[PDB]
Scaffold this active site. Structure first.
Site, PDB file in Angstrom:
ATOM      1  N   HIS A 160      -7.358  -4.522   5.323  1.00 48.47           N
ATOM      2  CA  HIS A 160      -7.266  -4.685   3.905  1.00 48.47           C
ATOM      3  C   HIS A 160      -7.596  -3.335   3.267  1.00 48.47           C
ATOM      4  CE1 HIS A 160      -8.935  -6.015  -0.273  1.00 48.47           C
ATOM      5  NE2 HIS A 160      -7.691  -6.775  -0.155  1.00 48.47           N
ATOM      6  N   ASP A 192      -5.744  -2.049 -11.777  1.00 47.65           N
ATOM      7  CA  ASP A 192      -6.466  -1.731 -10.535  1.00 47.65           C
ATOM      8  C   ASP A 192      -6.833  -0.243 -10.599  1.00 47.65           C
ATOM      9  OD1 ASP A 192      -7.333  -1.874  -7.817  1.00 47.65           O
ATOM     10  OD2 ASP A 192      -5.475  -2.844  -7.157  1.00 47.65           O
ATOM     11  N   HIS A 427      -7.548  -6.331 -10.319  1.00 42.98           N
ATOM     12  CA  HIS A 427      -7.674  -6.281  -8.840  1.00 42.98           C
ATOM     13  C   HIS A 427      -8.613  -5.141  -8.387  1.00 42.98           C
ATOM     14  CE1 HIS A 427      -5.941  -5.632  -4.661  1.00 42.98           C
ATOM     15  NE2 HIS A 427      -5.912  -6.959  -4.653  1.00 42.98           N
ATOM     16  N   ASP A 452     -12.186  -3.132   5.709  1.00 43.71           N
ATOM     17  CA  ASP A 452     -12.177  -2.524   4.371  1.00 43.71           C
ATOM     18  C   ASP A 452     -12.855  -1.168   4.371  1.00 43.71           C
ATOM     19  OD1 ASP A 452     -10.648  -4.014   2.361  1.00 43.71           O
ATOM     20  OD2 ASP A 452     -12.032  -5.684   2.798  1.00 43.71           O
TER      21      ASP A 452
HETATM   22  P1  LIG Z   1      -6.746  -7.577  -1.526  1.00 48.43           P
HETATM   23  O1  LIG Z   1      -8.014  -7.497  -2.584  1.00 48.43           O
HETATM   24  O2  LIG Z   1      -5.652  -8.563  -2.824  1.00 48.43           O
HETATM   25  O3  LIG Z   1      -5.483  -6.543  -1.604  1.00 48.43           O
HETATM   26  O4  LIG Z   1      -6.513  -8.973  -0.565  1.00 48.43           O
HETATM   27  C1  LIG Z   1      -7.476 -10.034  -0.452  1.00 48.43           C
HETATM   28  C2  LIG Z   1      -6.930 -11.427  -0.604  1.00 48.43           C
HETATM   29  C3  LIG Z   1      -5.496 -11.494  -0.017  1.00 48.43           C
HETATM   30  O5  LIG Z   1      -5.338 -11.102   1.365  1.00 48.43           O
HETATM   31  C4  LIG Z   1      -4.040 -11.319   2.020  1.00 48.43           C
HETATM   32  O6  LIG Z   1      -3.807 -10.802   3.100  1.00 48.43           O
HETATM   33  C5  LIG Z   1      -2.972 -12.171   1.367  1.00 48.43           C
HETATM   34  C6  LIG Z   1      -1.737 -12.334   2.268  1.00 48.43           C
HETATM   35  C7  LIG Z   1      -0.871 -11.078   2.325  1.00 48.43           C
HETATM   36  O7  LIG Z   1      -7.906 -12.356  -0.081  1.00 48.43           O
HETATM   37  C8  LIG Z   1      -7.683 -12.928   1.244  1.00 48.43           C
HETATM   38  O8  LIG Z   1      -8.141 -12.355   2.216  1.00 48.43           O
HETATM   39  C9  LIG Z   1      -6.923 -14.237   1.351  1.00 48.43           C
HETATM   40  C10 LIG Z   1      -6.036 -14.293   2.593  1.00 48.43           C
HETATM   41  C11 LIG Z   1      -4.853 -15.232   2.408  1.00 48.43           C
END
Ligand SMILES: *P(O)(O)(O)OC[C@@H](COC(=O)CCC)OC(=O)CCC
EC number: 3.1.4.4
Length: 493
Positions: A160, A192, A427, A452
């Site tokens: 992420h 963001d 975001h 992260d």
């Molecule tokens: P981030 O802060 O939006 O870029 O992602 C966190 C969010 C979404 O993650 C995903 O991978 C979505 C599917 C592409 O929170 C999660 O981890 C939820 C996972 C479905």
């Protein structure tokens, strides 16, 4: 000390994750926030940057973000190292990358390039092929690795982090996914922020990416975990950064930084060097279901490989005066995650109890992708209950909260929504304390077990720039949604 906030955070990280120092976290000196001569605050790569205008006509932030990506890549002489959350970069994000690689190739440079995405368990070979086609002749000068990865299906763990490091010298990082539909070609763009820096802390990002790629390359034959694709007959490059760039990057300024990430779940189970002995709190309203293993609140070994969680809680705990938090969310959707980080809420409660002011701006629940709560009361009720443990009861908790909290949902203009009628999505993963020290990165404050990365920067100058260019305009427009605002005696919670 000139750096009381980083000193405290550093002391925590060396207790939590000593065996990860250098790789997953690292304190450096000699960095610079990489702004322009005309506008020194423009290291702060916010998007869209259209304050006051519900039509978002003049996107000065987006323009600068895309320009800076191309600038930095176009100055590459050795490496380009990119991570993000899938999908792979598209639209003008991809255009900016391609333009930069072509610019660098025309200057005669031969580059190694890694592009890593985290994914739910997309297609790397197709993205490699698309990129190679668009590069033209420049592709002769480039050795490319492209991968998608999932580290744990059951803990929902994958990359992420959103990083762009060039030559180990420059780094852009933050919350910005390279997703054209959400950020660019839309009249309701997501709000963001990334930052741009240079110096040794960029090398820290390179070593974090080597950590992720070392895992990725080791698992490249495991189909449930990794999809890998390279140019030509090139191999997987687990240690491109270590192999190609100085162990310490050159100094560019006088800014002190802590780089801090996390390994999620499924890369490494514990830091065997750690002797961390946490005091873990208890609560009956975070774990919604009895089956759930809570890595955020109830797994010591998890903390030791996820120093970022501890770093963020320590940054909150360092504040003498005031804390500003801008997030998508403080709370997660349960299941599969627990509702909230108890220690974080306990840290915020401790601060309010001592008269330190706390502002939390989250995304409008009307977005519920970009929100995980129905109402701001899910945050204020929680803060109150945790304050009750340390103020002697519920009434004295409510008072401490109303006297020290600003709580609201985000707007960027006088309008409650964008002019196209869609709610504002936010975001950021932003925390600032004392107009002094701030975190900008990818780590959300809501429970999340992902890989992260981000930077904690102690520079009053830059933090005042952050105030002027982002937090002040944010609170100018967002304060009209507040359920709690000590500065105006509002207390509807
Ligand atoms: P981030 O802060 O939006 O870029 O992602 C966190 C969010 C979404 O993650 C995903 O991978 C979505 C599917 C592409 O929170 C999660 O981890 C939820 C996972 C479905």
């Amino acid at each position: 000390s000139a750096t009381p906030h980083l000193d405290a955070v550093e002391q925590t990280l060396r207790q939590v994750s000593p065996g990860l120092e250098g790789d997953v976290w690292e304190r450096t000196s000699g960095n610079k926030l990489d702004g322009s001569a005309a506008d020194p605050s423009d290291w702060l790569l916010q998007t869209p940057g259209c304050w006051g205008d519900d039509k978002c006509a003049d996107r000065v932030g987006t323009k600068r973000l895309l320009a800076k990506m191309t600038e930095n890549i176009g100055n590459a002489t050795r490496t380009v190292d990119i991570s993000t959350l899938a999908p792979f970069p598209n639209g003008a994000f991809q255009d900016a990358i391609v333009a930069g690689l072509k610019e660098s190739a025309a200057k005669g440079n031969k580059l190694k390039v890694r592009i890593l995405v985290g994914a739910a368990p997309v297609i790397p070979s197709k993205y490699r092929d698309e990129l190679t086609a668009k590069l033209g002749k420049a592709a002769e000068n480039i050795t490319l690795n492209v991968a998608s990865m999932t580290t744990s299906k059951t803990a929902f763990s994958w990359n992420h982090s959103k990083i762009l490091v060039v030559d180990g010298q420059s780094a852009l990082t933050g919350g910005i996914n390279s997703w054209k539909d959400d950020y660019l070609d839309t009249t309701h763009p997501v709000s963001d922020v990334d930052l741009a820096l240079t110096g040794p802390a960029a090398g820290s990002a390179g070593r974090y990416l080597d950590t992720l790629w070392t895992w990725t390359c080791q698992n490249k034959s495991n189909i449930a975990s990794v999809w890998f694709a390279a140019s030509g007959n090139a191999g997987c490059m687990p240690t491109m950064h270590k192999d190609t760039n100085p162990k310490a990057s050159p100094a560019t300024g006088n800014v002190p930084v802590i780089a801090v990430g996390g390994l999620g779940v499924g890369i490494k189970d514990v830091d065997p060097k750690s002797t961390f002995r946490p005091d873990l709190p208890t609560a009956s309203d975070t774990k919604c279901v009895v089956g759930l293993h809570d890595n955020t609140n109830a797994d010591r070994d998890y903390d030791t490989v996820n120093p970022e969680e501890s770093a963020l809680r320590a940054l909150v705990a360092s504040a003498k005066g005031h804390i500003e938090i801008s997030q998508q969310d403080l709370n997660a959707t349960c299941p599969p995650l627990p509702r909230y980080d108890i220690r974080l809420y306990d840290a915020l409660a401790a601060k309010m109890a001592a008269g330190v002011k706390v502002r939390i701006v989250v995304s409008d629940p009307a977005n519920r992708g970009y929100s995980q709560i129905k109402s701001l009361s899910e945050i204020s009720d929680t803060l109150r209950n945790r304050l009750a443990n340390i103020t002697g009861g519920q009434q004295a908790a409510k008072t401490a909260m109303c006297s020290n909290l600003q709580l609201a949902t985000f707007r960027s203009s006088p309008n409650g929504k964008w002019a196209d009628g869609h709610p504002y999505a936010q975001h950021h993963k932003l925390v600032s304390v004392d107009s002094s020290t701030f975190y900008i990165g990818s780590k959300n404050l809501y429970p999340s077990w992902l890989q992260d990365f981000g930077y904690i920067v102690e520079s009053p100058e830059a933090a005042k720039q952050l105030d002027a260019k982002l937090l002040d305009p944010q609170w100018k427009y967002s304060q009209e949604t507040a359920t709690v605002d000590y500065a105006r005696g509002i207390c509807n919670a």
